[PDB]
Amino acid sequence: SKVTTVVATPGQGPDRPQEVSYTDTKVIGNGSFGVVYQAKLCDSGELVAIKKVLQDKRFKNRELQIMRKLDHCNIVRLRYFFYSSVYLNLVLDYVPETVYRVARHYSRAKQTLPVIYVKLYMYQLFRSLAYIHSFGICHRDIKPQNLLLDPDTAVLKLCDFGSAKQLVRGEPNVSYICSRYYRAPELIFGATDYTSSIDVWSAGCVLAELLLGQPIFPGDSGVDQLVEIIKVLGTPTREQIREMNPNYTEFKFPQIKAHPWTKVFRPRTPPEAIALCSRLLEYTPTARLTPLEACAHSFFDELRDPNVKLPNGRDTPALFNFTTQELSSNPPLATILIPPHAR
Amino acid sequence: SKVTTVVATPGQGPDRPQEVSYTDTKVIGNGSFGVVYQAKLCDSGELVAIKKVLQDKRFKNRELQIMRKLDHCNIVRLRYFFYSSVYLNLVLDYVPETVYRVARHYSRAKQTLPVIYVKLYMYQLFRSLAYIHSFGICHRDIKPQNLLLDPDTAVLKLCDFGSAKQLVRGEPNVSYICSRYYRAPELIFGATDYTSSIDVWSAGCVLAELLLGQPIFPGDSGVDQLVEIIKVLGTPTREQIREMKFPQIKAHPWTKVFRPRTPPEAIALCSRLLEYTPTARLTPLEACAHSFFDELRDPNVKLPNGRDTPALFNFTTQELSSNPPLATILIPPHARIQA
Numbered sequence: 154s155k156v157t158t159v160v161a162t163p164g165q166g167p168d169r170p171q172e173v174s175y176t177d178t179k180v181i182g183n184g185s186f187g188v189v190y191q192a193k194l195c196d197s198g199e200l201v202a203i204k205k206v207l208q209d210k211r212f213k214n215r216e217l218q219i220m221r222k223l224d225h226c227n228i229v230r231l232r233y234f235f236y237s238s239v240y241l242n243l244v245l246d247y248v249p250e251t252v253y254r255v256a257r258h259y260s261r262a263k264q265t266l267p268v269i270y271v272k273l274y275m276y277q278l279f280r281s282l283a284y285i286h287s288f289g290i291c292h293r294d295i296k297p298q299n300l301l302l303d304p305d306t307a308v309l310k311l312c313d314f315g316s317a318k319q320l321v322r323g324e325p326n327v328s329y330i331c332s333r334y335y336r337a338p339e340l341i342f343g344a345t346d347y348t349s350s351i352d353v354w355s356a357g358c359v360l361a362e363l364l365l366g367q368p369i370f371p372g373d374s375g376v377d378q379l380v381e382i383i384k385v386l387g388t389p390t391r392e393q394i395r396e397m398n399p400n401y402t403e404f405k406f407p408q409i410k411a412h413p414w415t416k417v418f419r420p421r422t423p424p425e426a427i428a429l430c431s432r433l434l435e436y437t438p439t440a441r442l443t444p445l446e447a448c449a450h451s452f453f454d455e456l457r458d459p460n461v462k463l464p465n466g467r468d469t470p471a472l473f474n475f476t477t478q479e480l481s482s483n484p485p486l487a488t489i490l491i492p493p494h495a496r
Numbered sequence: 497s498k499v500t501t502v503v504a505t506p507g508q509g510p511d512r513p514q515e516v517s518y519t520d521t522k523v524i525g526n527g528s529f530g531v532v533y534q535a536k537l538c539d540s541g542e543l544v545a546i547k548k549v550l551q552d553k554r555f556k557n558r559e560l561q562i563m564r565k566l567d568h569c570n571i572v573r574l575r576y577f578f579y580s581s582v583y584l585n586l587v588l589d590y591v592p593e594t595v596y597r598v599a600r601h602y603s604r605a606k607q608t609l610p611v612i613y614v615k616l617y618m619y620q621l622f623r624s625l626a627y628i629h630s631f632g633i634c635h636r637d638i639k640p641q642n643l644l645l646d647p648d649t650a651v652l653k654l655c656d657f658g659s660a661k662q663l664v665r666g667e668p669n670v671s672y673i674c675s676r677y678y679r680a681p682e683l684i685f686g687a688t689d690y691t692s693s694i695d696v697w698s699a700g701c702v703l704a705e706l707l708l709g710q711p712i713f714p715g716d717s718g719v720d721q722l723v724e725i726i727k728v729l730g731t732p733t734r735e736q737i738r739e740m741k742f743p744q745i746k747a748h749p750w751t752k753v754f755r756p757r758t759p760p761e762a763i764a765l766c767s768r769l770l771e772y773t774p775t776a777r778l779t780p781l782e783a784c785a786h787s788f789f790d791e792l793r794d795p796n797v798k799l800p801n802g803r804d805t806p807a808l809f810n811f812t813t814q815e816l817s818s819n820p821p822l823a824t825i826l827i828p829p830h831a832r833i834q835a
């Protein structure tokens with residue numbers, strides 16, 4: 154078949170390009186950004202994904218700059234990058250499924266994702282967030298379609314850093330990032346001074362969705378979304394509104410009082426799952442758990458049990474190889490995060 | 497069959513309570529706002545819609561206050577309102593179809609609505625907007641699901657004033673109103689000083705959608721939406737952004753957007769509605785006067801089913817107030833013939 158050879162620059166290390174050959178190209182994803190292809194490396198026979206985007210030569214691609222610095226087991230790895238035509242081509246790890254597709258399979262089969270997988274996937278997402286956040290980097294587009302999954306190993310990898318940005322105190326950021334159902338209230342209210350905790354709200358929406366079988370805060374307009382949020386969290390206090398967006402414009406919302414979180418999910422739902430959701434989906438941004446505190450939550454204790462296994466009989470992926478960087482926001486959590494048996 | 501009798505206040509006359517009895521109730525629409533039912537009046541056997549929403553005792557319902565003052569052939573009429581349980585119930589005209597349902601029928605059959613209907617529906621939507629805007633009222637949620645249609649008469653009625661508000665110069669307004677695909681760029685950018693022209697952008701999105709067979713500016717995030725907009729309008733100039741980090745793609749020949757044989761006037765109207773600079777967009781009245789609607793002003797025009805078109809020229813002074821001289825185009829010669 155058609156073999157393409159290019160001279161590409163390695164994602165990490167010194168800037169020393171090498172000839173790379175690949176074949177068996179085919180589309181696997183789209184979006185406004187550009188196209189994602191699957192390809193096979195002639196050398197190793199390995200499958201990789203190539204994300205191709207139009208690049209204005211007069212400026213540095215921000216996604217590329219962020220990817221060159223990331224190195225984590227729960228984030229898709231940038232293997233190489235090269236230019237063609239002008240297009241920037243990001244050669245990344247290929248993962249065969251997404252949380253989006255898997256949840257949809259269960260959904261239209263009238264089944265819910267077994268909790269052991271909800272635990273595994275969410276724990277790995279929080280690890281990836283603790284890592285990028287320790288560098289001040291906010292993903293800003295956490296949603297099921299951006300959570301890659303390997304069906305057999307149960308490994309999850311965060312992808313698509315096209316909206317990612319280092320958030321700096323006092324510097325304004327656009328409020329129009331983040332996909333519909335996963336946007337934190339402060340973004341809906343138009344704040345430009347938000348923090349990385351908007352990713353935590355997004356992660357809480359994904360957890361709730363996996364437990365429920367459908368999005369927890371749907372709506373075609375910001376108003377409709379806020380109504381679904383109010384039905385569950387109750388009406389925001391004047392103080393809470395202040396904390397979300399210092400410059401709120403003022404709207405009249407029907408004063409509704411908190412709907413018992415336990416009344417939200419089906420009866421069999423683990424109580425720890427519900428408590429974690431309530432600590433993630435909070436109006437006050439600073440009141441939400443940090444990613445690391447989420448990883449340490451009791452909902453994930455089963456993952457720390459010495460004898461846990463995947464339903465397919467294999468062992469769980471690596472869950473405890475935390476680095477100092479990863480733990481930097483709160484070192485003492487290591488006593489919970491790294492169980493007695495792990496190494 | 498269960499019959500409900502309530503004592504209700506008339507939509508607009510003097511406050512003379514009336515006894516209203518209805519039956520055969522069923523949900524025809526839902527939403528975060530409140531449920532809309534269809535019901536049958538016992539006496540005349542006529543169908544009506546009942547929109548029921550929770551009513552706080554802190555404020556009087558804004559949709560209710562706005563609808564008590566509206567009277568127009570292209571806006572659904574508030575007949576009565578009454579409270580129950582506390583719920584506010586608005587009794588309104590019933591229309592059997594929506595642009596949303598009609599467009600979906602054609603779309604999933606790989607066809608587009610015949611252009612004569614695009615003309616009729618869009619013209620009537622622009623008339624309804626010229627009317628509410630002449631009172632400074634902005635709908636703020638123009639979308640296919642809020643455009644009611646009568647299949648046989650081709651009459652269109654604007655509905656759902658749950659987001660509507662009188663916009664006053666210098667007063668801030670929330671930027672989180674309006675549905676996803678139909679939001680003006682300035683709302684996506686978070687402006688709180690927008691004008692009624694956000695309804696015009698929304699109307700342009702509906703026209704483009706009816707011509708195309710699918711939404712013209714889809715996207716799950718504001719960023720994705722802006723990229724689809726830029727692909728068509730080109731990159732906003734610094735000045736345009738002011739009036740309201742993306743790749744500098746240029747101006748896309750709107751002609752490349754629609755299928756071959758799409759009327760050139762349809763394309764020109766779309767380009768004058770979907771403009772970055774809000775003040776640069778046509779006003780509703782100017783849109784009605786656009787050449788894309790000339791066929792509706794032809795003395796011999798008929799609906800495909802053979803019936804005559806609905807009333808299109810009975811403009812009032814209020815309706816024309818934003819630009820009286822347009823009447824020389826809006827009211828065709830044959831519509832001025834003496835009785």
Ligand SMILES: O=C1Nc2ccccc2/C1=C1/Nc2ccccc2/C1=N\O
Nearest residue numbers: 182189202245246247248249250312313
């Ligand atoms: O394996 C992958 N590596 C990536 C790196 C960056 C962006 C996407 C991907 C990607 C993807 N893998 C998929 C498997 C099934 C359906 C969609 C995708 C996808 N993308 O839609």
Ligand SMILES: O=C1Nc2ccccc2/C1=C1/Nc2ccccc2/C1=N\O
Nearest residue numbers: 525532545588589590591592593655656
């Ligand atoms: O006939 C109507 N009068 C209304 C007044 C206010 C709000 C809605 C309506 C309304 C509606 N008519 C419909 C016909 C088919 C599907 C949905 C609707 C609907 N609404 O979804």
